[PDB]
Write a protein that binds this ligand. Structure first.
Ligand SMILES: CC(C)CCC[C@@H](C)[C@H]1CC[C@H]2[C@@H]3CC=C4C[C@@H](OC(=O)CCC(=O)O)CC[C@]4(C)[C@H]3CC[C@]12C
Ligand SMILES: C[N+](C)(C)CC#CCOC1=NOCC1
Lengths: 278, 57, 222, 339, 233
């Protein structure tokens, strides 16, 4: 315990950044009247999705890898698996709306944001959460009660359909693989229009573009590769490696207030005012 | 003759303001001072009013 | 809450409903400020107290305002762009046009507002430099040191000694624009005449770029 | 000679005025007032916020009953407010979106507005048909209207950017008297309580007292170094205060005919957009360009408070007839009622 | 200029249905709330229904709730009253009233003529005086009483005064107990406190003879007084 507590200490430290990083986004949306815009609605909903991860998901997961077995009720890990998976689904789908919002605000700077209103932004966030809730929460709470019975050991807790290579591969495409094609396609088209503008009349364009698309791929692709080989194979993944890619999925929750909110200079000024002049 | 007429009008305007009755500052200072002490109880900003009589509670 | 002020509160709620429906309509239009001298011909730019003109290019509404040193310049703090028209033919008032453009560029309330520059009467400066007329280098003592004349040249051909006369007058205003501003606002120069009919598209293309820079700045892509 | 001889007489007349001015300054007003207790820290808090404007508020006037107020913004709307219950009584669309001034009649039956259209439009409120209609459009000014105040239901005085002030008969629509004598653009205008005089501050760093029934400039005041943006009258009626772009407020006296106090500070660089006095005249409230208002001591020349509730430039200011509220509008599209 | 023209009425069998209508001309009908007030031949003034501006708030009387429907058509400048399951107690003249509500407003200011329809926790307003002989040139005081304190906490007392001349629609005289209406001579005045009200007439003349009504606006239902008739000598 004198040597393995560093894993326990490191997880809670990077979790502590996630709560204070996300909370500073919501209070910047409140104390600054200039930030209360339609464009910043998706930044708040992303922070709301990432706030559930910081206070529930990584705190409950860090007990799983310290203890080494489940120490809660059987009808309490399923609620955690429903909450954690939907909120992580909501975080990715909120990024996809931002990619669509940034696409139309650049290619159509005169004909998009005028039509977009507070009613139009409501259905952007709404299907980012409803599709997140529908795709995962009935699939975990209503699985042992629908087909068969309980299959997980009492000492372990997984999504309980990892063994079936029918809905695991289908949901992996419908949660990570399909959105990562749209975010890569759209952001390259966004960078194309930045070079087109400068030629008519390149430095910070590639800096933000790389930071957006590498803080998402690195923190997610280990998990979505590891989940696919468990569709056909059973125990070819060491548990040391599996929880490493499982916890990398929460690092995107840490960096989302940095690479999306702090890119705006108005958010950065409000962050320094609240952090220093408390 | 526009410059002459402009200069002639300024002299007549200056003469109408150079000969007027003036009092000293100390009489003007006491007039502005004693106006405030005669109306200090009627100023809600200087003397705060209780919230029962406040119409902006 | 009595019976009547409840009905008065319902009247107010209908007023907020009517106040927010045209504010959405007001947010869909673009406001432009027109400035220039008496000989600039600023009225003959877009063929379409205060004079307000309406024109639409590619289904977005534009609003151009003509008024008529300038204390009222703080009213036009939130405009999309300012359209400045210069008499490039009249070499006598060009130095006055430089000084007037200096006041607009370095104004306190226009530190982030772009200026679309229209060098009007560009056909007339051709006859002043191709035919026999007053020397351009007389008024401005540095043209005859013609420099980089046609440093890069885009014209199919218009007796390219005219082009250097065009480029020198254009460079006298861009040097003012690049002197200060730190990239917050950008001056777009154009050469216009009375027979030109593509002026509405040039403002539309420039205003698309202006909104693009404001959009790119909040994502840190510029 | 001619212009050379006439210029020599103006210099001698100007020197005589300063010589007669110096003979009346026996002691400083700040020196004499250094015997009374300071007001202390004046703490005023926001009571309610009037929301509904979607552009920069440029003008606001209180009503006589100190419950109704009219606000002018760049969205082309005149909104009459019920300041007690936040309710909007009226929403008057404007033919021009560029208004720099607004006014409320003492009777309450009319409101006025004006701006870059050089027209003082007067709107009738208490009509039949249940709607607000424009009843008079006053034309004749060359420059932009900067201020307008109602003498009565049939008389109104306008300030304009044609370096002149005017007096109108609203029923006839004609300019009864034209006030000339300024050099620069006239920015603001205040009325004496007895209505027989009014003062105006212009861009020539000068303030001039005028007689409404005669049309002649009674007095001229020159102590500023920049554009005078605001002017107000001490409730006594024999003094007035000017706000200017040089980060300095000054108080003048009519009978003394010279400057009396200078309100300045080292940490204040921004100019003054609006000024207003209190019921007793002890407090002088001024709006600045640094997103907040400052409450000065009109006798002690010491800062007594700062009203910081706006995140944009404070453009207008207003104090009620009974002194029970202070309303501040700004460029952030909000109105705050302070107490 | 302002006109409220009514239509409908007639002789209806009991159990039938009618739809009264009121055409509005000469004023902004959209910004005005509307009220239906009946008048039985053997009774006084009774309130039926109310529709607000924008049709967001609708109130009915207890006698007509569930079988009467009130609606308005703002582009057509016409409000309706769909009356179903008629009885003999609904035989009356149905007046249409315009009304507006803001600070300093004067509701119940204009009434129209009425349709004569013939079928083959509420505050009570008491007008003790019924018939009063009045000579010209004298001063007449009319008093009204209620069952509650009509003064509210915002400094407003909601008492209205109406005058019904013979063969004429009732006309507003005093709104909120103290303020004179437009077009009313200055000789009329109103004063009082909670539960005790008084209308004062000074130097009475011709065309000042009729049944005076006392109405409260503190809380719907809207209740009128019995009436105070004035007669010559
Ligand atoms: C990978 C999948 C599961 C993501 C979940 C589906 C939706 C949450 C996303 C995917 C595609 C998005 C759409 C892509 C294109 C458009 C068209 C776009 O059209 C406009 O720009 C009209 C202007 C306006 O929105 O007012 C409006 C947003 C919308 C519907 C987006 C809304 C959000 C959508 C439906
Ligand atoms: C993997 N973890 C359980 C830690 C959080 C999650 C999740 C959902 O997986 C997704 N892949 O791409 C979008 C959602």
């Amino acid at each position: 315990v004198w040597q393995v507590v560093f894993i326990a200490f490191l997880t809670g430290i990077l979790a502590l950044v996630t709560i204070i990083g996300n909370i500073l986004v919501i209070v910047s949306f409140k104390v600054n009247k200039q930030l209360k815009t339609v464009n910043n609605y998706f930044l708040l909903s992303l922070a709301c999705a990432d706030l559930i991860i910081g206070v529930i998901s990584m705190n409950l997961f860090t007990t799983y890898i310290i203890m080494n077995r489940w120490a809660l009720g059987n009808l309490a890990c399923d609620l955690w698996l429903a909450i954690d998976y939907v909120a992580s689904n909501a975080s990715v789908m909120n990024l996809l709306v931002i990619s669509f919002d940034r696409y139309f605000s650049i290619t159509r700077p005169l004909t998009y944001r005028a039509k977009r209103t507070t009613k139009r932004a409501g259905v952007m966030i709404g299907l980012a959460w409803v599709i997140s809730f529908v795709l995962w929460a009935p699939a975990i709470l209503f699985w042992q009660y629908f087909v068969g019975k309980r299959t997980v050991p009492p000492g372990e807790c997984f999504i309980q359909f990892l063994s079936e290579p029918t809905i695991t591969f289908g949901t992996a495409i419908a949660a990570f693989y399909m959105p990562v094609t749209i975010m890569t396609i759209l952001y390259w088209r966004i960078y194309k229009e930045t070079e087109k503008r400068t030629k008519e009349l390149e430095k910070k364009a590639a800096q933000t573009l790389s930071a957006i698309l590498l803080a998402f791929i690195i923190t997610w692709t280990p998990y979505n590769i590891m989940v696919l080989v468990n569709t056909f194979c059973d125990s070819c993944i060491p548990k040391t490696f599996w929880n490493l890619g499982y916890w990398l999925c929460y690092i995107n929750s840490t960096v989302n207030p940095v690479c999306y909110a702090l890119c705006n200079k108005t958010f950065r000024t409000t962050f320094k005012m609240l952090l220093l002049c408390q | 003759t526009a410059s002459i007429a402009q200069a002639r009008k300024l002299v007549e305007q200056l003469k109408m303001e150079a000969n007027i009755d003036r009092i000293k500052v100390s009489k003007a200072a006491a007039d502005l001072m004693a106006y405030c002490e005669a109306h200090a109880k009627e100023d809600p900003l200087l003397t705060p009013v209780p919230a029962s009589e406040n119409p902006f509670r | 809450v009595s019976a009547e002020d409840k009905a008065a509160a319902e009247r107010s709620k209908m007023i907020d409903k009517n106040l927010r429906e045209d504010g959405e309509k007001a947010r869909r239009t673009l406001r432009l400020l027109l400035l220039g001298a008496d000989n600039s011909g600023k009225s003959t730019i877009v063929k379409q107290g205060i004079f307000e003109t309406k024109f639409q290019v590619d289904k977005v509404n534009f609003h151009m305002f003509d008024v008529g040193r300038r204390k009222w310049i703080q009213c036009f703090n939130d405009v999309t762009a300012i359209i400045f028209v210069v008499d490039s033919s009249d070499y006598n008032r060009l130095q006055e046009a430089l000084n007037d453009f200096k006041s607009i560029w370095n104004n306190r309330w226009l530190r982030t507002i772009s200026v679309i520059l229209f060098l009007n009467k560009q056909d007339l400066l051709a006859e002043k430099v191709l035919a026999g007329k007053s020397k351009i280098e007389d008024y401005f003592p540095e043209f005859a040191r013609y420099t980089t004349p046609e440093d890069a040249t885009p014209e199919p051909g218009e007796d390219p000694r005219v082009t250097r006369a065009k480029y020198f007058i254009r460079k006298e205003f861009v040097d003012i624009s690049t002197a200060s501003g730190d990239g917050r606002h950008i001056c777009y120069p154009h050469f216009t005449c009375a027979v030109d009919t593509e002026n509405a598209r040039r403002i539309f293309n420039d205003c698309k770029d202006i909104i693009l820079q404001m959009n790119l700045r909040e994502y840190n892509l510029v | 000679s001619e212009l050379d001889q006439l210029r020599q007489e103006a210099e001698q007349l100007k020197n005589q005025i300063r010589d007669a001015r110096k003979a009346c300054a026996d002691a400083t007003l700040s020196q004499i007032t250094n015997n009374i207790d300071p007001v202390g820290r004046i703490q005023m808090r926001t009571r309610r916020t009037l929301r509904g404007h979607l552009a920069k508020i440029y003008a606001m006037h209180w009503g006589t009953d100190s419950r109704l107020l009219v606000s002018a913004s760049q969205d082309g709307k005149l909104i009459i407010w019920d300041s007690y219950t936040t309710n909007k009584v009226h929403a008057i669309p404007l033919r021009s979106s560029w208004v720099m001034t607004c006014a409320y009649a003492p009777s309450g039956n009319y409101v006025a507005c004006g701006g870059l259209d050089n027209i003082c439009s007067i709107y009738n409120l208490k009509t039949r048909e249940g709607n607000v209609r424009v009843s008079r459009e006053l034309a004749g000014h060359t420059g932009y209207l900067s201020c307008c105040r109602f003498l009565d239901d049939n008389q109104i005085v306008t300030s304009s950017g044609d370096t002149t002030c005017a007096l109108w008969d609203i029923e006839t629509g004609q300019q009864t008297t034209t006030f000339t004598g300024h050099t620069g653009d006239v920015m603001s205008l205040s009325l004496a309580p007895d209505t027989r005089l009014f003062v105006s501050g212009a861009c020539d760093a000068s303030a001039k007292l005028w007689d409404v029934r005669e049309g002649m400039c009674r007095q001229t005041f020159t102590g500023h170094e920049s554009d005078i943006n605001a002017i107000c009258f001490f409730p006594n009626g024999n003094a007035f205060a000017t706000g200017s772009d040089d980060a300095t407020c000054r108080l003048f006296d009519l009978r003394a005919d010279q400057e009396l106090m200078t309100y300045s500070h080292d940490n204040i660089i921004c100019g003054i957009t609006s000024v207003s006095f209190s019921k007793s005249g002890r407090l002088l409230l001024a709006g600045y360009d640094d997103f907040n208002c400052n409450v000065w001591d009109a006798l002690k020349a010491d800062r007594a408070g700062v009203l910081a509730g706006h995140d944009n430039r404070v453009s207008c200011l207003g104090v009620t007839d009974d002194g029970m509220a202070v309303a501040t509008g700004s460029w952030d599209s909000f109105l705050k009622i302070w107490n | 200029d302002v006109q409220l023209v009514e239509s409908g009425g007639g002789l209806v069998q009991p159990g039938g249905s009618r739809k009264l209508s009121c055409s509005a001309s000469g004023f902004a009908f959209s910004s005005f709330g509307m009220h239906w007030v009946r008048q039985a031949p053997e009774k006084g003034l009774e309130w039926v229904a109310y529709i607000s501006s924008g049709s967001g708030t609708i109130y009915y009387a207890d006698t007509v709730k569930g079988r009467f429907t009130i609606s308005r058509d703002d582009p057509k400048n016409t409000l309706f009253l769909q009356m179903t399951s008629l009885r003999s107690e609904d035989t009356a003249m149905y007046y249409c009233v315009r009304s507006i509500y803001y600070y300093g407003s004067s509701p119940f200011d204009f009434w129209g003529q009425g349709t004569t329809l013939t079928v083959s926790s509420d505050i009570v307003m008491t007008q003790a005086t019924s018939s009063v002989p009045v000579t010209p040139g004298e001063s007449v005081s009319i008093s009204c009483r209620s069952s509650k304190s009509l003064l509210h906490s915002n400094g407003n007392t909601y008492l209205y005064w109406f005058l019904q001349r013979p063969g004429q629609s009732p006309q507003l005289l005093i709104y909120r107990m103290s303020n004179l209406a437009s077009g009313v001579p200055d000789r009329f005045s109103g004063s009082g406190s909670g539960t005790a009200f008084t209308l004062t007439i000074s130097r009475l003349e011709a065309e000042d003879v009729g049944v005076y009504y006392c109405m409260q606006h503190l809380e719907y239902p809207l209740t009128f007084g019995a009436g105070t008739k004035l007669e010559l000598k």
